[PDB]
User: Fold Fiber protein from Human adenovirus 37.
Amino acid sequence: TRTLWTTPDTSPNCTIAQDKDSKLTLVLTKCGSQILANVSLIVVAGKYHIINNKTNPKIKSFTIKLLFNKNGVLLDNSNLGKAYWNFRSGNSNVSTAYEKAIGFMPNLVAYPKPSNSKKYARDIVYGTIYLGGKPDQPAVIKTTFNQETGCEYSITFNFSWSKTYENVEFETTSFTFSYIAQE
Amino acid sequence: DTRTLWTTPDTSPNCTIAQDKDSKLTLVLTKCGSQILANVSLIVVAGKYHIINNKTNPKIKSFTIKLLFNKNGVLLDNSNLGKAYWNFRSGNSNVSTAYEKAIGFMPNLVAYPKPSNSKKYARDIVYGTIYLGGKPDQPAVIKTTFNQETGCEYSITFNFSWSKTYENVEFETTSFTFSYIAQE
Amino acid sequence: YDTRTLWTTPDTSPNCTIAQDKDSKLTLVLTKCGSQILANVSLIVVAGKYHIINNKTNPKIKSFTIKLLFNKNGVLLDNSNLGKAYWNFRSGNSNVSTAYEKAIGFMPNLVAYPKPSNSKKYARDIVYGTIYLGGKPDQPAVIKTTFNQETGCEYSITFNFSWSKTYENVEFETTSFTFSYIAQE
Ligand SMILES: CCC(=O)N[C@H]1[C@H]([C@H](O)[C@H](O)CO)O[C@@](OCCCn2cc(CN(Cc3cn(CCCO[C@]4(C(=O)O)C[C@H](O)[C@@H](NC(=O)CC)[C@H]([C@H](O)[C@H](O)CO)O4)nn3)Cc3cn(CCCO[C@]4(C(=O)O)C[C@H](O)[C@@H](NC(=O)CC)[C@H]([C@H](O)[C@H](O)CO)O4)nn3)nn2)(C(=O)O)C[C@@H]1O
Ligand SMILES: [Cl-]
Ligand SMILES: [Cl-]
Ligand SMILES: [Cl-]
Ligand code: NA
Ligand SMILES: [Zn+2]
Ligand SMILES: [Zn+2]
Ligand SMILES: [Zn+2]
Assistant:
């Protein structure tokens, strides 16, 4: 029944374009064979803080990657900082870094690493979130399992938009999804 | 605690949007540790929002259903949802005693703070779309907001809206699932 | 043995018959979180009529249905599109070795989602979602899931897939979708 999370405060914990430019709020709750996931994003500074596609027509997407080793431990090339990711204790985290979280990893049979074998779309979940909570400011959140190199498991969030936003702050509504657990 | 707080799954009106008991809100909240798994649908049976005609009434485009809770997670009487059949599940009905404590089912206050002079972040909203009459060409938006009402310690608010011009369409919906971060 | 999960296994071995025998893999995982079932679904078509969609050549091919029919004990009936052989409780990445006898706690609730009758039919028993063919964001298809509307069974879950765009040689294999439903017990 346990939960891996980023504390749900607004303290930046994530680096998209520059150090600590964002707060990823991610909560993974183990419900047996499935992980129930809840995600939102606040960009606080830098390139993706205020979108202006009149000024910058090609600024239309970015990616946040969580890379994990064989024990389900977060690797430092991840966009999310290691100090910010742990099992929940109250509204905070355990003060000791976890050793094992394989039960939270995306299942490798469901979602295999890239190979020469046919690639299926099963390892992707699509959703839409809304910038500033406004229903006319959609952005697509594409979540992909186990497609990154340099790791045993991965979860990546690609944010993209097709509208021409003029001075829109990139901070989002929340989205829930699930995925099949490794064990 | 993997308990379920719900409205019961019957179709007996339990909700007051425009007039007394004009609707059945079916809401099921199931605790999976630090997240609440929520399932929701709505049937309007009477009054202003029962049969929508936007040719004759083009400005009838949205309405709101509020659930207000005290410090103990107990539903307040001024909610649109009636208190009588909002309780922990037993079979297809409820436990025989009104609950006194459900803080573990409340939306987390750090994730979703009450209104203040601090910046309001969008992460206290979840958007979804449901379909009137089960028809794929009859979308309506369900906007769910956590802890943005006053006169309570916690809240869940459902705003229903639509942009299509409906003509004599009965407002009864498909179901939507979401989750939120639990207070404890 | 995992008593809280009924699934198809996560492999890609065909287990489903839409238009011809074993033309598809339905990956379906039902996880009991008490009074709610958390469901995760995707579909891979490997052969036959629904494998490669070409609506220039075949303008009428726009939808199909996959039916799961259950008896009073929550056991899958053999007229379901999904095969009984690999629908079972989880054991690792496989299944428990004997066929299950009871799964009533995984069935969609009959008061929430009643069988057809003279009583008014409500839309509550439907969940709509959209999945994406080939993982491409410009290739939507609608997944309409309906609870307990089939005859000849105690319970049912049916998945209707449809699309409105004119696809030209698009393989029908989907992204994943999550939903939940109210459990019978
Ligand atoms: C699950 C069942 C279902 O989907 N039902 C839908 C049915 C059904 O498909 C058919 O009836 C068949 O049964 O169709 C409906 O629509 C068809 C008839 C009406 N219609 C609408 C359109 C869209 N346009 C016309 C148009 C619409 N607008 C509305 C304003 C603009 O849109 C927003 C906005 O403000 O930006 C979008 C935003 O998300 C809305 N917010 C919410 O919904 C909040 C939850 C917002 C809001 O509603 C208003 O602001 C409130 O006032 O509106 N303007 N103009 C025709 C059109 C053609 N295109 C181009 C591409 C078509 O779309 C796809 C694609 O196929 O490529 C669709 C695909 O899903 C997208 N992928 C993703 O989103 C990934 C997650 C892609 C992708 O975005 C791009 O490819 C980029 O990669 O685009 N666009 N518009 N046309 N016709 C119906 O019958 O009513 C809707 C039912 O919901
Ligand atoms: Cl655990
Ligand atoms: Cl009441
Ligand atoms: Cl045809
Ligand atoms: Na606007
Ligand atoms: Zn700013
Ligand atoms: Zn009516
Ligand atoms: Zn193929």
